[PDB]
Amino acid sequence: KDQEIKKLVDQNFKPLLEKYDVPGMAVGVIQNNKKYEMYYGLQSVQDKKAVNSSTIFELGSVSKLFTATAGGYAKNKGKISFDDTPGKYWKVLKNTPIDQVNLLQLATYTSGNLALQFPDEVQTDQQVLTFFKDWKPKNPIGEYRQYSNPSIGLFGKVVALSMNKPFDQVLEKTIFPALGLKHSYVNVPKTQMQNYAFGYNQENQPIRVNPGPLDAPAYGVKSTLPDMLSFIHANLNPQKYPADIQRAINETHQGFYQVNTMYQALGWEEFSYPATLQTLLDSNSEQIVMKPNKVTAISKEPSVKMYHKTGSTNGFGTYVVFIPKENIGLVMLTNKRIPNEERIKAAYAVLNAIK
Ligand SMILES: *[B]([O])([O])C1=[C][C]=C(C(=O)N([C])[C][C])[C]=[C]1
Ligand SMILES: [Cl-]
């Protein structure tokens, strides 16, 4: 029965490579602290290099999980409080309208007036500052969730400002080593560029992520399948890790509000387990992802929970999910975007067949 792990992924994930012309895919599964690694296709079409345990993928919005873990690390260490405001750390924002939104509201996209991306005009560091200086409120603060890169991006910058280090160093020198990650980078070094996969757009043209405003805390992490399986293992068994990172992980497993059947935790999206397939798919619907939605208090606190998160760049797709009481998790990494529903459906079929 331990061999069906390899067989179940070939039935549900492998057909997606041909269906959407995906050059490479890496699917990992952890069950009872045992890791399974399945690699498909090529990380580089022109180089005919196959996807392996060293292939580096762009995590996209799954990077937000590491930003949330970084915030939980600073909160437990006393460097921040979720009730603090960004002006306390970014001094030029003090008394500005954005200084009325606390850090927890920035991390959970409830500022009331922040869209999915920065405007196209916002590029340089000065233009990022001018954006949050001129920021005016719209919806009542804390009442409307709108999935936003600027929101959690500012949250990550404040976390970095409270740790007296730039954000990329916070992850690479503190968070990643605390999680046991060996090849996770905000900036991929030259000695690892041969492992950095090419992404592929809808025309199957090789591409990689471009520099952008607050790109690192919003979508700037690149990682490998063994590292992401270690990150899942850390989320499944935080009590096995040192106290500083363990309490950081626990900070990301607490829902703060609901939107229909989705509980918004720190970075992670939380659901009552067992969850229906449509519940997980609804989290990635256009209504939940692109539009504002009024939030409600957590009424039913689920005793048995599950967590997932989709992430995408222009040429990469990502999906991670784990179930603590089943001690099972899955990671999908692809060097071409496939519909979010397809990633969730395939992982839903794999997890339910392994009890
Ligand atoms: B994500 O939720 O994986 C995500 C969506 C969009 C962006 C973005 O702003 N850009 C420009 C990259 C496509 C990042 C992450
Ligand atoms: Cl300042």
* Residue 221 burial class via C-beta count within 10 angstroms: exposed 0-12, middle 13-18, buried 19 and up: buried
Length of the chain counted residue by residue: 355
**Could you tell me if 118 and 132 are in contact, meaning their C-beta atoms sit under 8 angstroms apart?**
no
- Alpha carbon of 355 to ligand 1 centroid (Å): 33
Please state the three-class secondary structure of the chain as a single string.
Answer: CCCHHHHHHHHHCHHHHHHCCCCEEEEEEEECCEEEEEEEEEEECCCCEECCCCCEEECHHHHHHHHHHHHHHHHHCCCCCCCCCHHHCCHHHCCCHHHHCCHHHHHCCCCCCCCCCCCCCCCCHHHHHHHHHCCCCCCCCCCEECCCHHHHHHHHHHHHHHCCCCHHHHHHHHHHHHCCCCCCECCCCHHHCCCECCEECCCCCEECCCCCCCHHHHHCCEECHHHHHHHHHHHHCHHHCCHHHHHHHHHCCCCCEEECCEEECCCCEEEECCCCHHHHHHHCCHHHHCCCEECECCCCCCCCEEEEEEEEECCEEEEEEEEHHHCEEEEEEECECCCHHHHHHHHHHHHHHCC
* Residue 339 burial class via C-beta count within 10 angstroms: exposed 0-12, middle 13-18, buried 19 and up: middle
C-alpha to C-alpha distance for 24 and 5, rounded to whole angstroms: 19
Neighbours of 1 (CB within 10 A): 6
Tokens describing residue 263: 């509980």
* Identified catalytic residue from 44, 61, 111, 184: 61
**C-alpha to C-alpha distances, 96 to 113, 187, 309, nearest whole angstrom:** 14, 32, 32
Best residue among 310, 313, 344 to mutate for probing ligand 1, ranked by most atoms within 8 Å of CB: 313
Experimentally determined by: X-ray
Sign of the Cα pseudo-torsion (324, 325, 327, 330, in order): negative
At residue 102, what are phi and psi to the nearest 5 degrees?
-80, 170
**Could you tell me if 246 and 238 are in contact, meaning their C-beta atoms sit under 8 angstroms apart?**
yes
Q: Residues with Cβ < 8 Å from 151, sequence gap 6 or more? A: 106, 107, 109, 111, 114
**C-alpha to C-alpha distances, 203 to 22, 59, 92, nearest whole angstrom:** 11, 20, 43
Catalytic residue check, 147: yes
**Could you tell me if 292 and 145 are in contact, meaning their C-beta atoms sit under 8 angstroms apart?**
yes
Catalytic residue check, 53: no
| Residue 307: strand pairing partners | 270, 322
- Alpha carbon of 312 to ligand 1 centroid (Å): 6
**Could you tell me if 204 and 336 are in contact, meaning their C-beta atoms sit under 8 angstroms apart?**
yes
Atom 15 (ligand 1) nearest CA = 61
Tokens describing residue 120: 């196209």
C-alpha to C-alpha distance for 57 and 220, rounded to whole angstroms: 11
Best residue among 208, 219, 334 to mutate for probing ligand 1, ranked by most atoms within 8 Å of CB: 219
- Alpha carbon of 243 to ligand 1 centroid (Å): 32
Q: What domains lie within the chain, and their CATH numbers?
A: 1-355 (3.40.710.10)
* Identified catalytic residue from 36, 40, 147, 319: 147
C-alpha to C-alpha distance for 120 and 328, rounded to whole angstroms: 40
Provide the residue type at 258 as one letter: Q
C-alpha to C-alpha distance for 127 and 204, rounded to whole angstroms: 33
Phi/psi class of residue 112: alpha, beta or left (left: φ > 0; alpha: ψ in -120 to 50)?
left
**Could you tell me if 258 and 264 are in contact, meaning their C-beta atoms sit under 8 angstroms apart?**
yes
What's this structure's resolution in Å?
Answer: 2.2
